[PDB]
Design a protein around this ligand. Sequence first.
Ligand SMILES: [Mg+2]
Length: 177
Amino acid sequence: MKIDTTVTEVKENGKTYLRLLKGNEQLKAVSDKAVAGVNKIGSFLVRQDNIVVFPDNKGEFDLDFFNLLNDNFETLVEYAKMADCLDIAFDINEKSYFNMIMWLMKNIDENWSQSPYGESFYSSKDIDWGYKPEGSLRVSDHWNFGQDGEHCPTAEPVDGWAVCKFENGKYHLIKKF
Ligand SMILES: [Mg+2]
């Protein structure tokens, strides 16, 4: 879907801002909470109050993917708040990230925990860098890391966002996003 990507320097209350005036108008046909942004394939940024659409080099954005964000906006904002992310970013190549968040917000409960260091989540509060209880889950996009694959090793290859279960010293895939 094509939108206007001309950038205008607008003065508002004594400060200057870059805005896509016509693009912002046109996004009203598809959402009441979308803004057209400026920075080659296109991306999106989900903020607390709106979705920013960064069009591709044709001035076009993927409306089908946009509709997933727009229709499930409250879940995305709740995820970002929970995970301590000011905003969250998507590409057409980030459907697995979207699907992870949807699954996580449905399945998480008060006894889950998050890594202190990023967007990795655990089904227990009894987790640290060196101990995982058997049967506990981990939701993450990075596996088999550190030197020689020592950290969060998996029984078989896991590339990208996944849910795995810990048994006998290794993670075992149960859902690939
Ligand atoms: Mg065992």
